[PDB]
Amino acid sequence: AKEIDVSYVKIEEVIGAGEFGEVCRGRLKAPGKKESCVAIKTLYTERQRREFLSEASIMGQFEHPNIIRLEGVVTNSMPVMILTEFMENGALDSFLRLNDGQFTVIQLVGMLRGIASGMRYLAEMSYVHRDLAARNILVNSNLVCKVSDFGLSRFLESSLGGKIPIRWTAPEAIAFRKFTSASDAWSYGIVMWEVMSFGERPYWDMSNQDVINAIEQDYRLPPPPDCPTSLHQLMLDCWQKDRNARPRFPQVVSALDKMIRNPASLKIVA
Numbered sequence: 595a596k597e598i599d600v601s602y603v604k605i606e607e608v609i610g611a612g613e614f615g616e617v618c619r620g621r622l623k624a625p626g627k628k629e630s631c632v633a634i635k636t637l638y639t640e641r642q643r644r645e646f647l648s649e650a651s652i653m654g655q656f657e658h659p660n661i662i663r664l665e666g667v668v669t670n671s672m673p674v675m676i677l678t679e680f681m682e683n684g685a686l687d688s689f690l691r692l693n694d695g696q697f698t699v700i701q702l703v704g705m706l707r708g709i710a711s712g713m714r715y716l717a718e719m720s721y722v723h724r725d726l727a728a729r730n731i732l733v734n735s736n737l738v739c740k741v742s743d744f745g746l747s748r749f750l751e752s753s754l755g756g757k758i759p760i761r762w763t764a765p766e767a768i769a770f771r772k773f774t775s776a777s778d779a780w781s782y783g784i785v786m787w788e789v790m791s792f793g794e795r796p797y798w799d800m801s802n803q804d805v806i807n808a809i810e811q812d813y814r815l816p817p818p819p820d821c822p823t824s825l826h827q828l829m830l831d832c833w834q835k836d837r838n839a840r841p842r843f844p845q846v847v848s849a850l851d852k853m854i855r856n857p858a859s860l861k862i863v864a
């Protein structure tokens with residue numbers, strides 16, 4: 595679905611370095627449709643091409659305001675491209691670093707609510723994300739946060755799947771490679787911590803191995819400076835060792851909505 599004629603795409607600036615090629619900003623103009631801004635991912639073995647394009651296959655089946663929208667692919671022409679909606683503020687971790695301390699707690703909670711709604715939807719579709727991290731959240735001009743980074747490849751036990759993201763991964767997923775929506779809930783807690791810390795690196799003073807050891811020994815990240823206690827408590831709930839004890843994404847959204855309804859609750863900080 596959404597194969598598009600390369601003649602309809604005008605490539606503008608190179609805006610990032612992607613994991614397997616350049617990231618560009620461009621313009622898509624198709625007959626009968628208004629022109630739109632697009633982000634463009636470019637691409638190897640046939641296995642790697644099929645893994646690359648698997649992102650588009652799955653993205654094309656999602657439709658949600660907090661999930662990045664697929665515009666199309668260029669495959670019957672080289673270089674192979676994936677075109678999505680353009681997200682003007684780029685990745686959330688770097689966006690927050692650029693804007694450190696400059697958004698209100700209520701704004702940050704709205705961002706987290708958007709991400710949580712995107713995850714609620716993925717969980718409802720039985721899609722387990724496995725790499726949920728602030729770097730994989732994209733931000734538009736109205737501060738709407740959208741989940742990105744999809745595909746049907748597996749992590750490295752060469753495939754474009756990547757290494758397991760230790761700092762974002764639930765202990766049972768690291769130990770047993772059992773990835774579920776409950777392990778995504780653990781990652782979501784890490785994302786909450788990243789957002790409330792304006793894009794600080796999780797466990798910034800620890801190696802990947804130190805993090806594995808720490809979590810096994812009951813260490814959990816502390817509240818970021820100025821972080822409402824209620825938000826930190828929700829993080830701790832997401833980081834329960836027993837995956838079945840973690841909140842599900844509908845409960846995550848509902849908890850954030852209650853905070854938004856009752857903003858005085860956000861004034862309590864440790």
Ligand SMILES: Cc1ccc(CO)cc1N(c1ccnc(Nc2cc(N3CCOCC3)cc(S(C)(=O)=O)c2)n1)C(C)C
Pocket residue numbers: 609610611612617633634635649662676677678679680681682683684685732741742743744
């Ligand atoms: C194109 C694409 C396809 C698939 C996926 C994963 O699902 C993601 C994307 N990408 C998209 C999709 C939609 N919007 C964007 N916007 C974007 C904007 C900026 N800039 C905006 C201006 O300020 C500087 C930053 C920088 C980046 S990046 C690549 O450096 O993270 C991305 N990027 C990239 C993340 C590869």
Ligand SMILES: [Mg+2]
Pocket residue numbers: 657658
């Ligand atoms: Mg829908």
Ligand SMILES: [Mg+2]
Pocket residue numbers: 723724725743744745
């Ligand atoms: Mg991934």
Ligand SMILES: [Mg+2]
Pocket residue numbers: 725743756
């Ligand atoms: Mg990834």
